[PDB]
Amino acid sequence: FDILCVVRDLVDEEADERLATFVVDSHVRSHQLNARQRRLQRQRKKEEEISPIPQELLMKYIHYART
C-alpha cells in the first residue's frame, strides 16, 4: 500500500456536538409527470443541501477522467 488512512475516534465536548447536528440532519433528509418533476428537483435540492457538485455529475466526471 501507499496511502494509509489513519482514522481515530476521540471524545470532544464540541466537535462531537457539531458532528451530531450533522448526523441528525442527515437522518432527517433521508426520511405523475409533474409529480416526478417535483420529486426529482426536490431530491436535487437535497443534493444541494450538501452544497458541492451533485452526484451524477461526479460519476460522469470520474468516467470522463479515467477515460
Binding site: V11, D16, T21, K46
Partner: protein
Amino acid sequence: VDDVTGEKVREAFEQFLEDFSVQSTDTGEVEKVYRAQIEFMKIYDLNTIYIDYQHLSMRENGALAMAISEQYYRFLPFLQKGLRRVVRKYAPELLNTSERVFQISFFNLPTVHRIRDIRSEKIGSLLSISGTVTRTSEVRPELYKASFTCDMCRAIVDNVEQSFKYTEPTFCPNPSCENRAFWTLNVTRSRFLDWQKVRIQENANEIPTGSMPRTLDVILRGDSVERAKPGDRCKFTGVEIVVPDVTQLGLPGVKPSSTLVRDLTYKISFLACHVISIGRDQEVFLNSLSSDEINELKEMVKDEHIYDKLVRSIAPAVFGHEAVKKGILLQMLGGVHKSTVEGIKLRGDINICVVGDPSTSKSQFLKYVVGFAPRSVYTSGKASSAAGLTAAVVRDEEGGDYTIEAGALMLADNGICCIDEFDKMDISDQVAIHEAMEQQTISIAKAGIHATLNARTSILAAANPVGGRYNRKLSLRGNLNMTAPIMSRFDLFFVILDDCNEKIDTELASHIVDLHMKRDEAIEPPFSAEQLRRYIKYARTFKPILTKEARSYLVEKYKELRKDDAQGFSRSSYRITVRQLESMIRLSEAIARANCVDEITPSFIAEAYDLLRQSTTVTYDKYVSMMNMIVRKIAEVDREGAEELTAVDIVDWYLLQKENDLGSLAEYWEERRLAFKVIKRLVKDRILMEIH
C-alpha cells in the same frame, strides 16, 4: 361426460372473464376488470394473466372454482385453449404475435397448506404452499411445444412434451407415409419456456417445536421464474404434479413396472404458476383491513397506557426485568432503514444483546421471542459455525455448479435471529456476523461465485460473562471478553446482575411456584400474546420523523452521553460511538411506532436515552415518578412566581394528575395516604427543603 365437463368449464370460464368480475365503479376500478387486464396485457408483453380465485368462487357460487381447484391439471390446457376464443375477439395480439402461450396463474387462495399437508390425494390438484426458499437453481430453457421433422416426409409436427421423457409421434401425420423412423427434432420452431427449481422447506411457525422440518423441491415456470430469492418467505400457488425419477431403486422394492416397458418410479414436486413473496401503506393496510377489526385496533391504540400495558405483558412467565422486556418490545418494532441521499444507505434496525449472571432467565426471553416473533430462528451458536450462520456455498448436480445456502441470517430476514453464548462462539464465527450488523448485507466471494445478499435482520444475544458469573470486584473493561467492534454494534447493552434480597427473592419464589402450580396460572397479562402480534403488524408501518425540536435536544443529550464516559483521559469510549447516536435515533423511532405516533417528541428521546444508558418504600418506579412530577410542578410554580405550595395542595395536584388511575374511592383514599407518605419521605430525604 368429461369431454363436455371440460367444455362446460370452458363456457363458464370464458363467461366469467367475459362479464365483469368486479362490481366496483366510480370509487375503485371500472366494472369490467379482466377486459382491462387484457387491455393492459395487449399493449405490453406480459404473456400471462392473473385472476383472483375469490371471484371464481363468486362466479358460480364456487362450484366453478371448486371444480377448477379439486381437479385442475386436466383443465390447464382446456382453460388455456378456452382463453383464446376470448382474446381472439377483443385483443388481436395472437396473430400479430408472430407464441400462443398464456400462463393463467391464480392467486389469493383461501387456504394455504403447510408442506407436510401435501399428500398424493392432492395429485393434479391446485394448491397454495407457504414456505421458505433455499438453494435456487439457475434458469434453464425448457421445451414446451416442439417441431419434429419427419425423416423422409420432412413434415412439421407440433408435438407437445410432458416433462417426462422425449415424446415423439408414431406415424408421420403427413399421409404420404406412416413411418416410425425417429422424426428429426427441431429447436427453432419449438417454443421453450425456461424454468427455475428451488428447494422449499417448511417454516418454523407450523412445525411442532423440536421436530426436523421436512422439505421438498418446487419448480417455477413461465414469468414466475427469478421471482424467488434465498431466504424470502413465499406463498406459492399451483399444481401438485409428480415427476418420474428413474433414480429410485432398492430399499422400496415392490414398486411396479409397465409390463402387461420398465419401472415407472415417481416423486412428488409442486409446480407453481404464481409467486408471492411479500414477507404511506396505512392508506393500504387500513382499508385492506375490514371496518370491524379497525375497532379492535382503535381500542388497543387509543388506550392511554398501552406502552406500559404492553411492556409488562411481553414476558408473562418471566418475573419483572422491565428493562429488558422493554428492550425486546422495541426489537420487534424496527427503525426505518431509509436510505440517505443517493450516496449511501444506513441501517434501521436494533440489536439488543443481553449479558447476564446465572439464572437470570435470559434464555427464556429467546426461546419465547423465537416462538412469538415472526420468521425467527434460535441457534445455540457454539454448536453452529460461522459459514452456516451467514451463507453456505455448496455444489449442485443440476448444472454441476456452485450455489448458495440461505443459512440462518438470510432465512431470518425481516425477523429476529436470536443467538446464545457468544463467548462460547469462537471468533472464527463471531466474525461472520459483522456485515449483518451495520452494513446490513452479506457479501461472499467463494468458489468463483461473487454475490451479495441483503439480510435485513435484527439480531440478539445471551452470552454469559467471562467467569460464568462476573466479579463485582473487577471492573467491566476486562470482564466481558469481547472486542471493541462487536461490543459497539450492539445498539443496546444489558449487563444483567443477580444479587440477594428479601423483598425481591420472596416475590420471585412465589412467582416461580405459582408457575409450577399450574392451577395458579393467574399469569394473564393485559394483552394476550396474539393481539400483540396484530397490533405490531400495524405499528410496523409508521415511519415517523424527528421534526420536533427534540432534534436539537437530542444533539445536546448525546453530548453528555459522551461526557459521562471518561475513559482514561479524554480517551475514546468503550461502550458508546456515533453508532450509538444513530441507535438513539432508531430507538426513538421505534418507541414512536410503539405509541403509534409520528414525529417523535422530546419525551421519546428521553426514554430512549435512559433505556440506552443503563447497565417506607413502595413500588420503586411509582415513587420515582411521583418524585419527578412533583419536582417539575414545584419548579414551574417557582418560575411563575406563584405564592406557595402546600402538602394538601400537592395532593390535590395529583388528584388532578392521575384521574385515569380510576379504581375506587377506596383507592383514592389509599393513593392519597401513599402521596402523603411520599411527600413526607422526600421531606425525610434531602430533595426539597421545607419551610415553617
